[PDB]
Amino acid sequence: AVQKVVVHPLVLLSVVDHFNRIGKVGNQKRVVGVLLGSWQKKVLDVSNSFAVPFDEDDKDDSVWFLDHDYLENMYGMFKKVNARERIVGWYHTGPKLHKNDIAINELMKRYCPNSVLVIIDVKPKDLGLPTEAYISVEEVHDDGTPTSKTFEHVTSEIGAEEAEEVGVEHLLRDIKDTTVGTLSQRITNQVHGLKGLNSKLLDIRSYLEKVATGKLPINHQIIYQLQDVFNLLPDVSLQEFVKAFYLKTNDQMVVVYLASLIRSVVALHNLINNKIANRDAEKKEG
Amino acid sequence: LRQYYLSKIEELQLIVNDKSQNLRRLQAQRNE
């Protein structure tokens, strides 16, 4: 399909000022803008973005307005500036995927045959990586519905170019960074992974106990799609697994022990060098 | 009675002397 998408930090920083632009009310302001990139391979990159207006009601999830004329006008404008970038999709600043967004994607799919969308957390109060990405497919089911359009996930990450990296590093002078120090930030990565796993399992438990206790219909899929999760988690108290685990733990501990032994004599060398070069110097000086 | 009040400050002075000896190494490393 499209494999994975790369976001340059000019986008996802242009989004937050768009939320600061007309997010004065700040209740259900789903700010929508249009991406700009270049599918140079199956892998994709996006670099620029601009604005389109949008108003919709809290209820009545069918009333909305994507501006055709602003899209064509500012596309011609940015083509008069930048002839390399072509439109790839859109971003909405909703914290979760909505119900009427597929109508927006089906409307804008005339300009782009595979219009990806990027959910960007403007206020990421949950820990993790923002800017997830979705694309539209057909999910023909055996239930009886012919087809629907309910998207699916594509892997995403924040990339970098050789000039924007300078800017985002210089603007990161209000935070201490311990990334240079090793054997510490890996442990923080382990802690962050544990917290993310806890948050995802809490969400799964919340949904499952919500649909379990009367409220909401029992979805006939997922409950057997998540059945294969529990068929995994192999037995830790297995004989050959423990027998191999200690066999490799000792092999790692040999290298750790030799590292301590090769560190201690260097420390002793520095000690006796300092003591001799100090005592002879004070013999001369006194 | 009073010699207790001597020996307590003897131990505290030993601790103070040891820490003041230890601090100068860190002062030298900071200076470098």
Binding site: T178 | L6, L12, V16, L23
Partner: protein
């Protein structure tokens, strides 16, 4: 004057710890 000898020794002992705590912060940040 033995009371003043005891408390000044107790003063400098708990005050030498704030020097030994502040330097270890400074020597750690000066690497970065």
């Amino acid at each position: 004057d033995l009371y003043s000898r005891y408390k000044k020794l107790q003063q400098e002992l708990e005050f030498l710890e704030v020097q030994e705590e502040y330097i270890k912060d400074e020597q750690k940040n000066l690497k970065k």
